[PDB]
Amino acid sequence: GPPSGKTYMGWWGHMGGPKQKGITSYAVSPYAQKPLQGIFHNAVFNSFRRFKSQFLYVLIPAGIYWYWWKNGNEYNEFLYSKAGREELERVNV
């Protein structure tokens, strides 16, 4: 097969990261490891941490656009009622 260009991911053995030295791993078999030991206290406190650091960036745009949609929908159902029909007459023309 032909050669190809320089990529930024190699394969197992020549992956292409920087050379690393003196960094040791430690892992235990999952047969001697108890899974889901960290669901209780975890799904409460870590989930509250993940919500607290991260909710306000979602809650302010939702608040802005929901308030703007609600004000627009309220103004719609105002001016297509009997009370605002002359205003509908002057803004539709």
Binding site: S4, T7, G17, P61, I64, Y65, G72, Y75, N76
Partner: protein, 385 residues
């Protein structure tokens, strides 16, 4: 060597779904790709087993769909899976493209991957529109009419293009037959584009939610991301089973069970739920030609995205203002859909115009300016002089 490495066929299965080096920090948002693959297989298999009972004449389309839902054994399962799975296909694809915009997967060296993604998105919109016109309900007929008249807006040529599309003078029997043939055809082009998408992905590997390299700590595909994708596969099938079996006709429009009548126009012509932002973008422009150009530019402005992101760090993970304006953009897209679902009434015209402007301003003004300000803020926060 091993047989999964030395065989010609199993080497692709190996290097794609067994020994593919994935970054070990990717969360469940890097699972929508496998989920889209599963949902495409669902769409194709239900499409074949439901198109064995479908007759594509204009006088026999709606009756054959009802023949599927009534006389065919388990045919309601097939049609409800098919329509609601197309809805979930676009929902998972929207979440996948939002994962692309958020974590900066569009940036270099993954521009080819992003462009093939946009091509897949256009082909999928085309497939869904053609298959929705194959039902030939009320909404199907009148939506086909409105979209092809939008193609008649093209100057000096367009009327003959539309008489070519229709195969006649209005939406008639040749139109529905060629929409069924094209609708059978284009998903295999989508499958070929998906294979090209996987190639352009595999030449550099996935990104990670930090925006740094992942060449240091790679873990294989097999058993790790196989069982993580199996988790989200079972969740996706659970939610699809809810919206198929307990509430099937929620996402659809009830006018689509009226047969196609060319004489009666509906009170409100609305596409199916996911094409509504694009329909709102097109309806916000007070011109037919500029409306069609703006509707296609609303997808090509995703192609102009890697050239405007001037942020020197990849992805919106560790940046404040870019993350905030990203969620401004997402809820703006939802607001486009909800504007498009409404009528052409005060003040929805003005809000549709402002919402279209904030869409294009996010893709063209907000991202480069906020990325430049965020770069200078990162620099002067830590450099003292």
């Amino acid at each position: 060597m091993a047989f999964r490495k030395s065989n010609v066929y199993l080497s692709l299965v190996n290097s794609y779904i067994i020994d593919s080096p994935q970054p070990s920090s990717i969360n469940y948002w890097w699972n929508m790709g496998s989920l889209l693959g599963l949902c495409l297989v669902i769409q194709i298999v239900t499409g074949i087993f439901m198109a064995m009972h479908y007759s594509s004449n204009i006088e026999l389309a709606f009756s054959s769909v009802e023949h599927i839902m009534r006389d065919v054994h388990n045919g309601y399962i097939l049609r409800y899976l098919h329509a609601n799975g197309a809805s979930f296909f676009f929902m998972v694809m929207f979440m996948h493209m939002a994962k692309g915009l958020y974590y900066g997967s569009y940036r270099s060296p993954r521009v080819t991957l992003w462009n093939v993604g946009v091509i897949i998105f256009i082909l999928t919109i085309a497939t869904a529109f053609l298959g929705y016109c194959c039902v030939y309900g009320q909404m199907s007929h009148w939506g086909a009419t409105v979209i092809t008249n939008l193609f008649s807006a093209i100057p000096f040529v367009g009327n003959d293009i539309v008489s070519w599309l229709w195969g006649g003078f209005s939406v008639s029997n040749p139109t529905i037959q060629r929409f069924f043939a094209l609708h059978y055809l284009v998903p295999f082009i989508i499958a070929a584009m998906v294979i090209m998408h996987l190639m352009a992905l595999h030449i550099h590997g996935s990104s990670n939610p930090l925006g740094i390299t992942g060449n240091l700590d790679r873990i294989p595909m097999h058993s790790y991301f196989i069982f993580k994708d199996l988790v989200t596969v079972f969740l996706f099938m659970l939610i699809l089973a809810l919206f198929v079996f307990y509430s099937p006709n929620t996402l659809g429009h009830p006018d689509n069970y009226i047969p196609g009548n060319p004489l009666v126009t509906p009170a409100s012509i609305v596409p199916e739920w996911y094409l509504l932002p694009f329909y709102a973008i097109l309806r916000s422009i007070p011109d037919k030609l500029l409306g069609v150009i703006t509707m296609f530019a609303a997808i090509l402005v995703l192609l102009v995205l890697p050239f405007t992101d001037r942020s020197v760090v990849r992805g919106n993970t560790f940046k404040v203002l870019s993350k905030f304006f990203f969620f401004i953009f997402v809820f703006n897209f939802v607001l486009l859909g909800q504007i498009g679902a409404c009528h052409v009434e005060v003040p929805y015209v003005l809000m549709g115009q402002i919402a279209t402007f904030i869409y294009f301003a996010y893709f063209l003004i907000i991202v480069p300016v906020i990325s430049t300000i965020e770069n200078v803020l990162f620099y002067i926060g830590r450099v003292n002089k």
